[PDB]
Ligand binder design. Structure first.
Ligand SMILES: CCCCCCCCCCCCCCCCCC(=O)O[C@H](COC(=O)CCCCCCCCCCCCCCC)COP(=O)(O)OCC[N+](C)(C)C
Ligand SMILES: CCCCCCCCCCCCCCCCCC(=O)O[C@H](COC(=O)CCCCCCCCCCCCCCC)COP(=O)(O)OCC[N+](C)(C)C
Ligand SMILES: C/C(=C\Cc1c(C)c(O)c2ccccc2c1O)CCC[C@H](C)CCC[C@H](C)CCCC(C)C
Ligand SMILES: *[C@@H]1O[C@H](CO)[C@@H](O[C@@H]2O[C@H](CO)[C@@H](O)[C@H](O)[C@H]2NC(C)=O)[C@H](O)[C@H]1NC(C)=O
Ligand SMILES: *[C@@H]1O[C@H](CO)[C@@H](O[C@@H]2O[C@H](CO)[C@@H](O)[C@H](O)[C@H]2NC(C)=O)[C@H](O)[C@H]1NC(C)=O
Ligand SMILES: CC(=O)N[C@@H]1[C@@H](O)[C@H](O)[C@@H](CO)O[C@H]1O
Lengths: 693, 31
């Protein structure tokens, strides 16, 4: 009756003592909405396992014999053989089905939870924010009585058909969703998001077309995308709770999630969040919806009678709370407190700290940092001969997150140290030099290029000494940089570098990049040409013309970091483009009747379009024909009806699911009966990789 | 796997310019 107790659902007196808080978190409630969320979540995970978890492409990731570098959270974890991995994924699928249909719920939740976290912890390069959310929701749902309504276990056991559930299930779920929204909102108060640097180019998508009818492109790219996102995160946290402001909240959140689904390729995150939004409605909306149906349809829909008493809730007559009620209340409070604390727990695990904070995956800092890499070099020194060699950038790896994070770099170095000695390299010392920029800043080194990473020092609870600090003092320069970058022609390209004192950059400009120049913006550098061993000292605003096809070094001699730039034009491509344009112009002139003189023999293949009964085409002819074919293909792709695209999408997904099923069957047969001859295995694998059509 | 000195010190090389939203599923398949 009290106003303050009706907008929150509990009087203050219910929090006076422990025995009355346990009686509030175990109040009876209708199980209707929890069952619907359970069904949708299980179905979505069933759909998700063959697509994002990687059951389709599991035969090329964990292939036996292939030597690859793994990035597990713990060094003790190791993948099992491929067949047992397929068995693990089969257990995941069975558990997801059990959650969907509510059959053996408490065993199905375990069978889905344990394999999922094994896969999640086996690789650090596949930690999104939605995988963590799925794992957390499974962990919560393992303890919630969500099989009371619309479940097969209800049909089997008569004490769980339309039975009450304690209130703390809804409390935990709503708290999780609110934490997601609110922590995302507060994390998006970084200076980059509120200024318009994260997702700067997203305003060009056609879905933002109506907004441009009233605002310019830049304001649409600042007010709508960034500030709108922040405000929507906070408001989606708060509005859905209160009854007065739920329709508006549901509308905005649904529009937000549909647009996110179309704009990005996150996966099932948007649909899962859409499913989670109705949890804030009344606990009995499916029942009232079922009531408003014809009598004929109700013979298949769930029941509509009031739920029966359950032995998992405390009823007010009195009843002394038992043991499971207290554990439920404690679990709710502790879990929510831990979820609040974990995103801000980076002052304990300082080893994973970098330019950003902590490993990506559990901070809810979605779409806030964009990184661009310019170069990566790996150098090694043999411990016996003393020779120096250079390795490929990303050899023996299946992901590109080892560049940003130091803990993964240490594992990469150790893996290379173990693998190299079979290529005659004894006791290598491995150095790294990586150029990365975040949110359109100056390119700068992320790791020290003089430290032997193989025999360096790294602990999870201490700061790494070989990670360069971010030069945020050069942050305000960005407004100038675009002005420099927007004044160039259609051929010129520009690169920006900022370098530390005492370090030098050695660069080998290719023979194609003629007309390359270096200009200094801030600091003091000396540029050395090694061809004649001549070095020139440069002051601010001095331009130099570098060779094309020789080494050159730039040393930073100032006491503070120095910022400079490269401006280059690809002369070879320009000459090729002019020649190709001339050839196309001559062909057009011949076609329209001009240039009445007989065509050269080299031009004859161009008009004919087929090299038959004549000399092989020149490289210019081959390039022109390739460009013509590519243009025709693009034109054909653009001019396609919608239904063809939808049909191709459905066929591709059907192929993915079919390959997953057939490979899993082959693996299970290998496990149980045995392994047939090689020819039979090859034939079966060929059958698996067959387009449906 | 070994690469020459010249190819390992070529900063100005054509790279696949793009951003990096780490919360995006990789394509996985190809033509
Ligand atoms: C000695 C020890 C003393 C105790 C120490 C610990 C005290 C902890 C107190 C905090 C925890 C209290 C939990 C109470 C449970 C509770 O109220 O659960 C629910 C509330 O649901 C939740 O769990 C809410 C999750 C958080 C969502 C965000 C709320 C934002 C509020 C902002 C300020 C206003 C009662 O709701 P109901 O099912 O009756 O639904 C009716 C509500 N409306 C009308 C709004 C839809
Ligand atoms: C009460 C209701 C409350 C509200 C609930 C709201 C939420 C409900 C969600 C339920 C699930 C809806 C379907 C989800 C589908 C889905 O996620 O689609 C897909 C995944 O789902 C699928 O594709 C499912 C395909 C299943 C297989 C279908 C095969 C059908 C074959 C038909 C017969 C063909 C015969 C042809 C010969 C005659 C996502 O694709 P993507 O991530 O690659 O997206 C592409 C586009 N970009 C890149 C831009 C993102
Ligand atoms: C990319 C964006 C947010 C990142 C994100 C994502 C992808 C999520 O999945 C989240 C799920 C739960 C919690 C937080 C999440 C999150 O932070 C902004 C996307 C902006 C949007 C597409 C533009 C439209 C904005 C509103 C809806 C328009 C209202 C009308 C205005 C003119 C006021
Ligand atoms: C050109 O200038 C550079 C920059 O000072 C000279 O290099 C340094 O080289 C000396 C001699 O080997 C080293 O002792 C210093 O440690 C180097 N400096 C740094 C910061 O690393 C280079 O020798 C000069 N070249 C010529 C031909 O005079
Ligand atoms: C400079 O222009 C050339 C044009 O030839 C670009 O070359 C393509 O570059 C790739 C990658 O090295 C080669 O595999 C192709 O053979 C080149 N195409 C040709 C020869 O037609 C080159 O990428 C441009 N940029 C640089 C830095 O050289
Ligand atoms: C004489 C000698 O040392 N030979 C080995 C040889 O086994 C291998 O072919 C080569 C490259 O891997 O490494 C070295």
């Amino acid at each position: 009756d009290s106003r303050i107790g009706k907008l929150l659902g509990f009087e203050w007196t219910d929090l006076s003592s422990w025995r009355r808080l346990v009686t509030l978190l175990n109040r009876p409630t209708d199980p209707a909405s929890l069952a619907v969320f359970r069904f949708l979540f299980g179905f979505l995970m069933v759909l998700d396992i063959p697509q994002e978890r990687g059951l389709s492409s599991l035969d090329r990731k964990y292939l036996d014999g292939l030597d690859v570098c793994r990035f597990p959270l713990l060094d003790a974890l190791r993948p099992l053989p491929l067949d047992w991995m397929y068995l693990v994924y089969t257990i995941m699928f069975l558990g997801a089905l059990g959650m969907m249909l509510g059959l053996c719920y408490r065993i199905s939740c375990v069978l889905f939870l344990l394999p999922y976290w094994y896969v999640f912890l086996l690789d650090k390069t596949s930690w999104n924010n939605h995988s963590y959310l799925y794992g957390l929701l499974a962990f919560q749902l393992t303890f919630m009585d969500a099989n009371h309504y619309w479940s097969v276990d209800g049909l089997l056991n008569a004490h769980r058909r339309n039975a009450h559930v304690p209130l703390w299930n809804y409390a935990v779920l709503r708290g999780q969703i609110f934490i997601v929204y609110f922590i995302a909102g507060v994390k998006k108060l970084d200076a980059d998001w509120v200024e318009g640097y994260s997702m700067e180019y997203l305003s060009r998508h056609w879905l933002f077309s109506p907004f441009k009818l009233l605002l310019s492109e830049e304001l649409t790219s600042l007010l709508v995308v960034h500030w709108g996102g922040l405000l929507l995160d906070l408001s989606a946290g708060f509005l859905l709770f209160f009854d007065v402001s739920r329709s508006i909240g549901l509308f905005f959140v649904s529009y937000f999630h549909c647009m996110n689904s179309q704009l990005f390729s996150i996966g099932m995150f948007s649909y899962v969040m859409l499913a989670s939004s109705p949890l804030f409605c009344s606990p009995e909306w499916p029942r009232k919806l079922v009531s408003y149906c014809p009598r004929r349809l109700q013979q298949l829909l769930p029941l509509k009678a009031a739920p029966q008493p359950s032995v998992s809730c405390v009823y007010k007559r009195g009843q002394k709370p038992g043991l499971r009620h207290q554990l439920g209340a404690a679990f709710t409070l502790l879990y929510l407190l831990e979820q609040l604390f974990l995103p801000y727990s980076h002052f304990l695990t300082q080893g994973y700290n970098n330019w950003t904070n902590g490993l990506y995956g559990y901070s809810w800092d979605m779409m806030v940092h964009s990184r661009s890499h310019q170069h990566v070099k790996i150098t090694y020194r043999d411990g016996r001969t003393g020779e120096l060699g250079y390795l490929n950038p990303g050899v023996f790896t299946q992901s590109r997150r080892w560049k940003d994070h130091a803990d993964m770099l240490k594992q990469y170095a150790t893996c290379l140290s173990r693998l190299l000695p079979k290529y005659n390299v004894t006791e290598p010392q491995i150095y790294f030099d990586i150029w990365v920029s975040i949110n359109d800043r100056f390119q700068q080194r992320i790791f020290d290029p003089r430290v032997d990473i193989v025999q360096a020092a790294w602990s999870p609870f201490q700061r790494t000494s070989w990670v360069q600090p971010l030069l945020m003092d050069l942050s305000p320069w960005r407004a100038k940089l675009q002005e420099i970058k927007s004044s160039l022609d259609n051929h010129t390209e520009v690169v920006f570098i900022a370098d530390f004192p005492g370090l030098h950059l050695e660069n080998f400009v290719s023979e194609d990049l003629g007309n390359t120049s270096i200009q200094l913006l801030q600091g003091e550098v000396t540029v050395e040409l090694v061809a004649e061993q001549k070095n020139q000292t440069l002051r601010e605003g001095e331009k130099m013309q570098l060779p094309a096809g020789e080494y050159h070094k730039v040393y930073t001699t100032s006491p503070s970091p120095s910022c400079y730039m490269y401006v280059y034009v690809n002369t070879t491509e320009l000459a090729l483009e002019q020649d190709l344009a001339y050839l196309q112009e001559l062909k057009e002139k011949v076609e329209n009747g001009s240039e009445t003189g007989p065509l050269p023999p080299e031009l004859q293949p161009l008009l004919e379009g087929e090299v038959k009964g004549g000399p092989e085409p020149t490289p210019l002819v081959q390039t022109f024909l390739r460009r013509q074919q590519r243009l025709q293909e693009i034109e054909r792709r653009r001019n396609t009806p919608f239904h063809e695209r939808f049909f191709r999408f459905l066929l591709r997904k059907l192929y993915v699911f079919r390959r997953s099923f057939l490979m899993t069957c082959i693996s299970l047969r290998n496990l149980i009966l045995g392994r047939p001859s090689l020819e039979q295995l090859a034939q079966e694998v060929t059958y698996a990789n067959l387009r449906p059509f | 796997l070994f690469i020459r000195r010249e190819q390992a010190n070529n900063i100005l090389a054509r790279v696949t310019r793009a951003n990096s939203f780490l919360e995006e599923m990789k394509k996985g398949h190809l033509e």
